[PDB]
């Protein structure tokens, strides 16, 4: 098996003695490293990406240098976001009459004592 350039392009060459979406859907993929490290768009050529053979900087090599143990811990995230759904009391209503700009379809505004205003 002589190997070399002749081995290449078999069947795409004529004239011989013998003849005679680039980017993956955004929905589908979240990048490991975003920004300029994104791998969603297929850049052909001599890019910085790495194949099967290449063993190297990232992978187990980064991961196993340092010993770690992870515990299991109770998380009760306390935050505005977490409390977005916090159980609430029944919202105030106004039985007032008179012209008072008494809108009912807006966001809840409250007055002293929790009265809808």
């Amino acid at each position: 098996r002589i190997t070399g350039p002749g081995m290449l392009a078999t069947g795409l060459i004529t004239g011989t003695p013998e003849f005679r979406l680039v980017c993956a859907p955004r929905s589908d993929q979240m990048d490991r490293v975003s920004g300029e490290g994104k791998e969603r768009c297929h850049i052909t050529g001599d890019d910085w990406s790495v194949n099967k053979h290449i063993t190297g900087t990232a992978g187990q090599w980064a991961s196993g240098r340092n010993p770690s143990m992870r515990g299991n811990a109770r998380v009760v995230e306390t935050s505005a976001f977490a409390n977005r759904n916090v159980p609430k009391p029944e919202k105030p209503g106004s039985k007032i009459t008179g012209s008072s700009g008494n809108d009912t379809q807006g966001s809840l505004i409250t007055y002293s004592g929790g009265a809808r205003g």
Partner: protein, 92 residues
Amino acid sequence: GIALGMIETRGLVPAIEAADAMTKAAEVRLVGRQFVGGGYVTVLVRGETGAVNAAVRAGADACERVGDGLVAAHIIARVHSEVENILPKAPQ
């Protein structure tokens, strides 16, 4: 004026929107924005009761859909003197 209106929102972007709306709607002074913790941000305005009411309602309507939104919009027409001590006097 001495009424107080407050809007607490989840996040600062909603709060800045609310403050803008409030101050725009009526003749009110923004006396404070406080970061409560956990993402609650509270924006507080003073003025006359009517002014404050207009402002709070307007602000509320504004921020409800901005960001993670309004947690609370409240108006107090007479503030007990004791409470004044826990309320900001100028926005820092």
